A paper describes a structure:
Hence, this loss of critical proteins has the potential to compromise ER proteostasis and generate cellular stress. This challenge to normal metabolism is overcome by the activity of the cytosolic coatomer protein I (COPI) polymer, whose repeating unit is the coatomer, a 560 kDa complex of seven distinct gene products (α-, β-, β′-, γ-, δ-, ε-, and ζ-COPI)25–31. Overall, the coatomer functions to retrieve the escaped “client” proteins, such as type I membrane proteins, from cis-Golgi back to ER by retrograde trafficking. In particular, the S protein – a type I membrane protein – is delivered to the ERGIC from both the ER (by anterograde trafficking) and the Golgi (by retrograde trafficking)3,10–12. Here we utilize recombinant [name]-[name]-2 S proteins and tail peptides, including constructs with enhanced mimicry of the coatomer binding motif (clientized S protein), to elucidate the atomic structure of the S-coatomer interface.
Residue numbers in the entry: 0 to 301
The structure:
């Protein structure tokens, strides 16, 4: 067991941060900004590794593809771009959807990337097939806000949608395995998987102020977490600690106990609205990072 002991590792002021991600083996965080800029920071030495003026439009989605030394970003010009973060070379640059890109997910073992879009679809791209579009998942009836592979079975993934559903799909299958009606009448902003095999759980966040935990075997709602006072931008399970982290346009991060679902901490990090979240994939120092209107902060949770 490990006690909560929150330490501010690194904080950096900037334009609004829309996407944020951890590098799995370097002490780096990637941020994608509403200004069209993206930055990689070493949060342990507090040194900027690289910055790129990618576009003039907001860059909403960004992920490391560490095993190719890439970052992949999606922006409101409808385009996916890939950059080598060691050289700055632009690897590819294509219009992926005819509308905004909301979310990007990277398959852990196969050369697949998912993009969720306001065009009501999720699309699957294969970078070992010249970034071919291998599948478009159709069936949602509003903007697809968030996509996430099941870490315990990456042949499936979940899409959260403003049509108030989460759909779980299988690669190569045109119809979803199942559709969760969330009861979150304002729609689903975010979806995330519980990482460990002891619970088949998922978590959703909504503008209706609720965070809901779902059992994807029983398709039932396990718990509803209330406490935020404005739109909940995200909610995720921590990969190694028994906690949930959420962030809201009310300016706060909340840390919840993942067994009792009681709020343990409410943090005003002082950067106004909270928009995005990342956790270190292997729990290194239990790092988390969140992007806000006015920058991002990296915290060690214990």
């Amino acid at each position: 067991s490990m006690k909560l002991d929150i330490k501010k590792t690194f904080s950096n002021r900037s334009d609004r941060v829309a996407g944020i991600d951890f590098h799995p083996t370097e002490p780096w965080v990637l941020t994608t900004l509403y200004s069209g800029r993206v930055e990689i920071w070493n949060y342990e030495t507090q040194v900027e590794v690289r910055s790129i003026q990618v576009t003039e439009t907001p860059v909403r989605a960004g992920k490391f593809i560490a095993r190719k030394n890439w970052i992949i970003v999606g922006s409101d010009d409808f385009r996916i771009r890939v950059f080598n973060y060691n050289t700055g070379e632009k690897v590819v640059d294509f219009e992926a959807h005819p509308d905004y890109i909301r979310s990007i997910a990277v398959h852990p073992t196969k050369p697949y990337v998912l993009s969720g879009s306001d065009d009501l679809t999720v699309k699957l791209w294969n970078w070992e097939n010249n970034w071919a579009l291998e599948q478009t998942f159709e069936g949602h009836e509003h903007f697809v806000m968030c996509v996430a592979f099941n870490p315990k079975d990456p042949s499936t993934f979940a899409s959260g949608c403003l049509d108030r559903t989460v759909k779980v799909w299988s690669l190569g299958q045109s119809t979803p395995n199942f559709t969760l009606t969330t009861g979150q009448e304002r729609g689903v902003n975010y979806v995330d998987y519980y990482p460990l095999p002891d619970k088949p759980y998922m978590i959703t966040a909504s503008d209706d102020l609720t965070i809901k935990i779902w059992d994807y075997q029983t398709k039932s709602c396990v718990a509803t977490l209330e406490g935020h006072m404005s739109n909940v931008s995200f909610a995720v399970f921590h990969p190694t600690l028994p906690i949930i982290i959420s962030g809201s346009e009310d300016g706060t991060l909340k840390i919840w106990n993942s067994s009792t679902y009681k709020v343990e901490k409410t943090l005003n990090v002082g950067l106004e609205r909270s928009w995005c979240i990342a956790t270190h994939p292997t729990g290194r120092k239990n790092y988390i990072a969140s992007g806000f209107d006015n920058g991002f902060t990296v915290l060690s949770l214990g």
